[PDB]
């Protein structure tokens, strides 16, 4: 957590429905966007912090 990994996501088409519809993740909590609307929107400045 002190050296958390940041990955840039760009120039791809993302299907978040396969992430949402798969059931292993206990917490999928979104703040500024609806979970079900992620497939209907286009984004830039996408970052994954692990």
């Amino acid at each position: 957590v002190y050296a958390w990994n940041r990955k840039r996501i760009s120039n791809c088409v993302a299907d978040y429905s396969v992430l949402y519809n798969l059931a292993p993740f206990f917490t999928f909590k979104c703040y500024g966007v609806s979970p079900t609307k992620l497939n209907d929107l286009c984004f830039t400045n996408v970052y994954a912090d692990s």
Binding site: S17, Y20, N21, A23, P24, F26, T36
Partner: protein, 49 residues
């Protein structure tokens, strides 16, 4: 009905999912209560239910 343990979040209004879309759908203006409890003791078998 009987579902999985992790699928209890999909029994809610406005949700997109597999049992939400193709098995049981709730309306946006739904009123009522959802009850979920574990049934491993009764609805499971060692050979596979």
């Amino acid at each position: 009905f009987v579902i999985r343990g992790d699928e209890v979040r999909q029994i809610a209004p406005g949700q997109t999912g597999n049992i939400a879309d193709y098995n049981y759908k709730l309306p946006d203006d739904f009123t009522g209560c959802v009850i979920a409890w574990n049934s491993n003791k009764l609805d499971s078998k060692v050979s596979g239910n």
